[PDB]
DNA sequence: CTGCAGGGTTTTTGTACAGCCAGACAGTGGAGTACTACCACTGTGTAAGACAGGCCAGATC
């Protein structure tokens, strides 16, 4: 499978689709593959239906919040 | 059928020029920010000690 092994084999096994990636993003986004990269993930992890990853995974892209601001602390507190 | 070994075969794996920058190491001067135990206060449960009164023994009615 491609979870487990190095990254040496996985870039070797998967650098067909990532030069694809890479052509239509200088294609369509002009020098953007990660944002590219981002919304592939974010469209396979929607369909099927796992919305709580992507919900983390937009929270740690420019999250709002690892912590909280004191006032809505209080807000919960009382 | 079986076990075993040259090579295949595709995958995996590390070593390989070559330049770049995130990430860390020291320390400074002490603030300071997070933490941990007083602390003033009574509500709730607890159980030792009153105690009384009921009962048996002493002695009586």
Do not use: W
């Not at 067909?16 to 974010?42: H, M, R, Y």
């Not at 919900?55 to 507190?77: K, S, T, Y």
């Amino acid at each position: 499978h491609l979870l487990s092994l190095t990254r040496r084999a996985q870039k070797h096994r998967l650098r067909d689709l990532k030069n694809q990636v890479k052509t239509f993003a200088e294609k369509e986004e002009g020098g953007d593959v990660k944002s590219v990269c981002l919304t592939l993930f974010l469209l396979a992890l929607r369909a099927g239906n796992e919305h709580r990853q992507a919900d983390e995974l937009e929270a740690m892209m420019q999250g709002r919040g690892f912590g909280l601001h004191p006032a809505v602390c209080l807000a919960i507190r009382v």
